[PDB]
């Protein structure tokens, strides 16, 4: 379950209150803060890996009733979310830890915070950097490229 931390950010949208941070309690009993700018795993279908998203906004949406805690995200997509026919355009076999910045507006970016599984570390690498492949048996995901529905391209600014 989730709770806001502290005061809302200076108001921007009507009917919404924005927060920098959200508090998530586990059944391991502890409390974890997730902040705007951090990344989360988002529950998708039960047979698939979580979606990965960067949190770009956290908000209490007063336009739903009863009101809900929401996020707006920047999506990433996993290799398997890219059309099979377009996969070869990458020109290599990405590791399971590699994901792609999804640079397209067609999917809606608003989620309910209850779909959040938890934080994930996502790391931006230069194209010529190699993914570790180090130890920690890492839970970290790496991003090199964006995918626009047409081609792979550099990470946006």
């Amino acid at each position: 379950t989730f709770s806001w931390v502290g005061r809302p950010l200076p108001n921007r949208k009507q009917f919404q209150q924005m927060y920098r941070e959200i508090c998530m309690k586990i059944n391991d009993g502890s409390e974890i803060h997730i902040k705007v700018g951090q990344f989360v795993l988002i529950q998708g279908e039960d047979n698939k890996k979580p979606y990965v998203a960067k949190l770009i906004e956290l908000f209490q949406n007063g336009a739903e009733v009863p009101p809900k805690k929401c996020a707006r995200v920047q999506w990433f997509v996993r290799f398997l979310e890219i059309p099979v026919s377009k996969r070869h355009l990458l020109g290599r076999s990405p590791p399971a830890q590699e994901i792609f910045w999804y640079d397209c507006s067609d999917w809606d970016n608003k989620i309910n915070v209850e779909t959040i599984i938890g934080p994930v570390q996502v790391v931006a690498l230069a194209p010529e950097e190699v993914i570790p492949v180090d130890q920690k048996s890492e839970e970290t995901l790496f991003v090199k490229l964006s995918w626009n529905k047409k081609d792979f391209a550099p990470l946006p600014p």
Binding site: Q43, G44, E45, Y51, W75, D106, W107, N109, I111
Partner: peptide, 12 residues
């Protein structure tokens, strides 16, 4: 348990 998010279109 995390609720399921269903991605949906539009809303660009």
């Amino acid at each position: 348990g995390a609720k399921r998010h269903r991605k949906v279109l539009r809303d660009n």
